[PDB]
Design a protein around this ligand. Structure first.
Ligand code: 25O
Length: 127
């Protein structure tokens, strides 16, 4: 029932790059999802205490959220676009695993994911 520490967003010894694909992931992909009317539940780690989801972190062992992704991208945490794409996919999948089809939170995830897919379809070729 307690919350875990959040995912890492800072690690000085992890090598880092700022690729044009990673810039796209921030400027197009994160910004488009972040502004959406359905973003709010996804903008920070799931607070299993406030939300009274005491089993959340029993089920979800690789937590992810857009607040985390935002810090990673703003802090140039990543080496490549694929790491960041994986974070988005983890966030969506966790929601689907934890919840039931047609739950409001799942409809919200699906809307965000549709947009995510449309944007990732136009990921630019690496400069
Ligand atoms: C990412 C996420 C967010 C929320 C969440 C739901 C409502 C308000 C705030 C946050 N919930 N709630 C469940 N059951 N599963 C979730 N997954």
């Amino acid at each position: 029932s307690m919350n875990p520490p959040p995912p890492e967003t800072s690690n000085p010894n992890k090598p880092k790059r700022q690729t044009n694909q990673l810039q796209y992931l921030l400027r197009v992909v994160l910004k488009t999802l972040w502004k959406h009317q359905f973003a709010w539940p996804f903008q920070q780690p799931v607070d299993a205490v406030k939300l009274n989801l005491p089993d959340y972190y029993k089920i979800i062992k690789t937590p992810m959220d857009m607040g985390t992704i935002k810090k990673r991208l703003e802090n140039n945490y990543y080496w490549n676009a694929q790491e960041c794409i994986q974070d988005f996919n983890t966030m969506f999948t966790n929601c689907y695993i934890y919840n039931k089809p047609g739950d409001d939170i799942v409809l919200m995830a699906e809307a965000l994911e549709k947009l995510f897919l449309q944007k990732i379809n136009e990921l630019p070729t690496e400069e």
